[PDB]
């Protein structure tokens, strides 16, 4: 005979925005991988990463020799014009995250000694990628090393 209480917040979650946040998210988290990152949020996070990268570069003793830097899209683009291209990027906060070596490239080329092919195979470039990533994880003044 008695009529139980009307449970309005569930109905507010129905009729305003037609879904149900109230269920344990362990269903969706355990079964389904997370949603892929869209646009907008990408541009905002890249802009914040550009600002954090500027402020992290002005503190560290950057190599002042020929490394002209462009913060272009979260990637500092350390490029000496003669020989070498580096792209660096921090992951988290400003103080304590190390650097990631997103793309390393060697600009030195002669199309005759290297027999019409690249001077250095991607195997060796990836090896130097691991070595410089390790010496970044040594956490000295990193850019000089």
């Amino acid at each position: 005979a008695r009529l139980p209480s009307f449970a309005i917040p569930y109905a507010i979650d129905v009729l305003t925005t037609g879904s149900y946040p109230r269920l344990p998210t362990c269903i969706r988290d355990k079964i389904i991988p997370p949603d892929p990152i869209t646009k907008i949020e990408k541009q905002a996070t890249l802009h914040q990463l550009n600002q954090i990268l500027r402020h992290r570069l002005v503190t560290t003793d950057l190599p002042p020799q020929l490394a002209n830097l462009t913060v272009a899209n979260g990637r500092v683009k350390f490029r000496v014009e003669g020989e070498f291209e580096a792209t660096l990027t921090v992951m988290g906060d400003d103080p304590d995250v190390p650097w990631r070596l997103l793309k390393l490239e060697i600009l030195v080329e002669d199309k005759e000694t290297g027999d019409g092919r690249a001077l250095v195979h991607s195997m060796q470039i990836s090896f130097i990628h691991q070595l410089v990533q390790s010496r970044l994880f040594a956490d000295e003044k990193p850019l000089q090393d």
């Binding site: 290297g114 250095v120 195979h121 060796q124 070595l131 994880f137």
Partner: peptide, 25 residues
């Protein structure tokens, strides 16, 4: 239901890079 055969010299240079700059975990 390659390798252009000038990689011996690059590899020796890689070993000299390993010695002159060691990896650091």
């Amino acid at each position: 239901f390659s390798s252009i055969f000038q990689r011996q010299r690059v590899d020796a240079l890689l070993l000299d890079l390993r010695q002159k700059f060691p990896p650091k975990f």
